[PDB]
Amino acid sequence: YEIQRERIELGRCIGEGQFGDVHQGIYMSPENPALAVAIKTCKNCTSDSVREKFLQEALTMRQFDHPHIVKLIGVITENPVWIIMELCTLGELRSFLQVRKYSLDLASLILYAYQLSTALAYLESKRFVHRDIAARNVLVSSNDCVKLGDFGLSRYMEDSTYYKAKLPIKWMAPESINFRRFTSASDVWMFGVCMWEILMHGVKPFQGVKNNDVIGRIENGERLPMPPNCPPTLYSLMTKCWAYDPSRRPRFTELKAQLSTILEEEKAQ
Ligand SMILES: CN(c1ncccc1CNc1nc(Nc2ccc3c(c2)CCC(=O)N3)ncc1C(F)(F)F)S(C)(=O)=O
Ligand code: NA
Numbered sequence: 001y002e003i004q005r006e007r008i009e010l011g012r013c014i015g016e017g018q019f020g021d022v023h024q025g026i027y028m029s030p031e032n033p034a035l036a037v038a039i040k041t042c043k044n045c046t047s048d049s050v051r052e053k054f055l056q057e058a059l060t061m062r063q064f065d066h067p068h069i070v071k072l073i074g075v076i077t078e079n080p081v082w083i084i085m086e087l088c089t090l091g092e093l094r095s096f097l098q099v100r101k102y103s104l105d106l107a108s109l110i111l112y113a114y115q116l117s118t119a120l121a122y123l124e125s126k127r128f129v130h131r132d133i134a135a136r137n138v139l140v141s142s143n144d145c146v147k148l149g150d151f152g153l154s155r156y157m158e159d160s161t162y163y164k165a166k167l168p169i170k171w172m173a174p175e176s177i178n179f180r181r182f183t184s185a186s187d188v189w190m191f192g193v194c195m196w197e198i199l200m201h202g203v204k205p206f207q208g209v210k211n212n213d214v215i216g217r218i219e220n221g222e223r224l225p226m227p228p229n230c231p232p233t234l235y236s237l238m239t240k241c242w243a244y245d246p247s248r249r250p251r252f253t254e255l256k257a258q259l260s261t262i263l264e265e266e267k268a269q
Pocket of ligand 1: 149150151
């Protein structure tokens with residue numbers, strides 16, 4: 001899993017991470033075609049405690065191998081420490097959705113929700129609780145492929161460090177907001193919010209509502225409204241993710257199967 005720095009061509013900065021800037025680049029793989037990659041850099045990895053924390057993020061991604069989760073390519077443990085990830089060429093999902101708005105076919109939006117449900121069913125199969133499922137952590141590899149982004153770079157995951165700028169209340173299950181309970185069932189609640197975000201073309205949930213007012217509305221039975229053009233079967237599926245009792249929420253394998261049916265019904269106009 002070690003990569004040699006002379007095989008990396010560093011390109012433009014595509015974002016800022018907790019440990020340092022993230023760049024786009026090219027990895028000249030030995031005896032293979034060159035790959036487009038994302039490079040996580042570390043500014044203070046001279047410190048052993050910082051270096052080990054940064055390298056733990058690469059080990060977290062190394063344990064996963066799924067077509068809709070960004071893949072670890074390798075690490076450069078020489079000073080300055082770099083983590084090499086696969087690049088999702090088209091960038092962040094919210095920006096991509098905000099450009100296209102109604103020009104994206106409904107079949108593409110449902111496909112994105114289905115692809116994420118396969119990655120979340122895979123994480124659930126490994127007994128891994130995400131805790132930060134939101135459209136901001138989703139990347140676009142091509143017009144017909146989205147992926148979950150790096151877990152370390154995700155602002156509110158369990159082992160993620162904080163950025164200079166507390167909790168994503170508008171995405172969280174009631175038991176997570178009230179008692180900090182995070183399970184596979186609370187991940188299902190967040191995924192229903194993420195599906196709503198996709199069908200709303202990158203609009204954020206509960207805009208203009210204060211975080212403290214969200215739990216009162218949820219306890220009164222209020223939910224995010226049906227997005228314009230969203231098929232009623234898809235909205236019904238979202239409301240099942242938002243069952244107040246977590247034991248009544250479906251698991252990711254069921255959401256995957258139902259989304260595949262919804263997608264095939266839309267493709268048959
Ligand atoms: C949102 N995220 C970030 N948060 C903080 C820092 C960086 C990232 C993005 N990280 C990544 N970005 C890309 N692709 C990419 C992203 C942006 C742009 C472009 C390509 C080109 C067009 C453009 O203009 N910008 N692929 C892979 C990664 C990964 F492997 F590092 F995850 S996250 C939690 O990692 O999903
Ligand atoms: Na190296």
